[PDB]
Amino acid sequence: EWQDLAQLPVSIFKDYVTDAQDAEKPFIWTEVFLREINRSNQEIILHIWPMTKTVILGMLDRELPHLELAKKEIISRGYEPVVRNFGGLAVVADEGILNFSLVIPDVFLSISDGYLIMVDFIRSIFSDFYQPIEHFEVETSYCPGKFDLSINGKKFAGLAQRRIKNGIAVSIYLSVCGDQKGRSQMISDFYKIGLGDTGSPIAYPNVDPEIMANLSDLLDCPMTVEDVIDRMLISLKQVGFNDRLLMIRPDLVAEFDRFQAKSMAN
Numbered sequence: 298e299w300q301d302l303a304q305l306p307v308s309i310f311k312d313y314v315t316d317a318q319d320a321e322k323p324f325i326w327t328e329v330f331l332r333e334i335n336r337s338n339q340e341i342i343l344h345i346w347p348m349t350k351t352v353i354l355g356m357l358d359r360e361l362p363h364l365e366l367a368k369k370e371i372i373s374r375g376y377e378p379v380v381r382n383f384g385g386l387a388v389v390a391d392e393g394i395l396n397f398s399l400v401i402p403d404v405f406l407s408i409s410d411g412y413l414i415m416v417d418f419i420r421s422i423f424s425d426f427y428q429p430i431e432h433f434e435v436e437t438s439y440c441p442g443k444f445d446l447s448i449n450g451k452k453f454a455g456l457a458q459r460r461i462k463n464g465i466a467v468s469i470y471l472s473v474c475g476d477q478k479g480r481s482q483m484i485s486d487f488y489k490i491g492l493g494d495t496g497s498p499i500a501y502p503n504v505d506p507e508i509m510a511n512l513s514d515l516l517d518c519p520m521t522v523e524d525v526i527d528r529m530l531i532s533l534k535q536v537g538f539n540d541r542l543l544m545i546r547p548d549l550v551a552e553f554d555r556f557q558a559k560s561m562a563n
Contacts, residue, residue, distance in 0.1 A: 299417035300536050302405060307341045307533060308543035311526070314348035317377040323348070323396070324381060325556045327459065327466055329549060330400040334464040338402035342543060345397045347522045348390040350376040352483070355384030357499050361491030370486040374479070385457055386440040386502065387484050393475025393511065395522045396468065403463040411458050412444040415467045419446060419454065421536055422529045426516050437505035439484040440470075451510040472511045473522050481506035 310330075314322055323346040330342050352371045359380055361367055368378045376391070390396055399415060412432075420430050428448045435445045435452040446454035446469075457468045472480070485504035492501065513520045520528075533540055 299414055299421055302341060302401070302414070303537040304405070305339065305341045305402070307343050307538050307540045309343050309345070309530070309540055310543040310545075311345045314346060314351070317349055317351065320348065320351050320377055320379045321557075321560065322346075324384075325553055325560070327398060327400075327468075328556045329552050330398070331459065331461040331464045331466050332552065333549065334400045334402045335462050338404050338463065341402070342400035343397065343540075344400060344543075345395075345526060347392070347395055347526075349392070350374075351390045352376050352378050352487070353384060353388050353390065354378060354380045355386055356382060357385075357501070358387050358487075358491070360497070360499060361488075361501075362495035362497060363491055363493045366493070367487045367491035370483065370490050374483050376483065385442075387487060388440045388455055388470050389480040389484065390470065391475060391480070393473055393477075393522065394480075395471040395473050395525050398466050398468040401465045401467065403465060408458060408460075411460075411465050411467045412456055415456055415469055416444060416446065419469070419471075422525070422532045423512075423516070424532070426518070428516055435508055437503055438509050439481065439502055439504050441502055446471075448512075448515040450508075451515055452508060453510055453512045453515055471525065472509065473520060473525050474511050474513045477509055477511045477514075478506045481509050 314320055326344060330344060334342060371378045399418065416432050431447050432444045434441050434443050435447060438445060438452045440455045442455055444456045445452045454469055454471045459466045481504055485506065488501045
């Protein structure tokens with residue numbers, strides 16, 4: 298349970314992506330924090346990173362027969378395609394989507410435990426609402442996962458996990474407000490075009506725009522990404538966590554640039 302990690306301080310790193318040119322910034326920090334949590338395993342890092350209109354593509358997506366034609370579907374709605382060679386299935390980010398990561402040191406275990414740690418955190422964050430939050434895969438959502446979060450059968454969040462040595466990075470993309478039906482239709486179009494008539498052995502989701510929704514709608518309570526962030530930070534103190542500003546030491550920036558340089562030469 299989330300409250301079980303309260304022994305460690307939570308370092309906060311709010312770093313928005315305000316320009317499509319910095320779209321890779323969050324993923325670069327993920328790498329940095331995964332190493333740091335291994336060197337400094339006496340704390341938890343809460344990396345908050347909402348972004349401008351972006352569609353993050355993963356390993357399977359880039360194998361689409363007509364990829365470039367598909368990316369056009371993304372560009373036509375004013376979103377920027379970002380490719381992550383080892384990332385999961387296409388997910389959407391924008392002003393109405395909250396993305397963040399919990400970088401945890403393995404010092405208190407399993408892949409499931411990690412996901413369940415996030416589920417508990419989310420539930421705790423919205424404990425003031427009666428609507429119970431469930432987890433199970435919503436197969437017809439984009440980027441379906443065993444731990445998709447939903448309320449009344451509708452998915453409002455997708456989770457992801459990456460690990461390195463004794464460090465774990467659990468991430469989540471939460472639909473807070475905005476045009477969720479549009480985000481969904483965009484990805485459906487992406488896969489339709491990407492597959493064209495060529496097809497593929499890879500099982501890509503068959504997106505259903507009516508199966509996903511914003512949390513502000515599911516909770517019948519208008520809220521912005523900033524509102525959730527605040528609610529989330531407040532829930533920490535109540536649960537028993539002590540927090541502090543994560544300081545970007547020169548060393549951290551240095552490591553960031555190594556990962557950035559690596560990417561650039563690619």
